[PDB]
Ligand binder design. Sequence first.
Ligand SMILES: C[C@H](C(=O)O)[C@@H](NC(=O)c1ncnc2[nH]ccc12)c1ccc(Br)cc1
Length: 163
Amino acid sequence: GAMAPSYRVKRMDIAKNDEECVVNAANPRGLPGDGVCKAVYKKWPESFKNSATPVGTAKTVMCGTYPVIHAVGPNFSNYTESEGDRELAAAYREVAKEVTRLGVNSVAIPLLSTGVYSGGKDRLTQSLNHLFTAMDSTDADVVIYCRDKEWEKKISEAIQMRT
Ligand SMILES: C[C@H](C(=O)O)[C@@H](NC(=O)c1ncnc2[nH]ccc12)c1ccc(Br)cc1
């Protein structure tokens, strides 16, 4: 594990992360997809072999020796608020289990179920809180990657508020 496990946020492409493994905001079918998923596909295409997995789960596939953890968050256009919230929390718990199993000292992670899976709602606080609930008991350094400029400031404030 990391010597002093921490949380950090960076506004940049997760495909260019400086961590020991990456979490993909995957679709359930293991398709190249769009946004984060497409960037992950362009960088580690070999990791998409048999990467299909149900909503609320995570499946790791190695690209060489670099682990890609395909985490499938719910699309809130399809799920109710209650059922979607439960699947989103579950997807993050499965990511924590995989990060622990892999023995990595750091992990790059995006905010699951935001953007096109958000059902047109701002889900920064909801997704980030579920990320903390799952990762708080792990000892990996967590680096959150985002694209929205207002989101970088909000995530940074949320991390600092807890320290
Ligand atoms: C809404 C969120 C953000 O702005 O942080 C967005 N992130 C991104 O697209 C994004 N964030 C980090 N590295 C990236 N590389 C290429 C894209 C990209 C995102 C949308 C939908 C889902 Br599901 C998950 C994440």
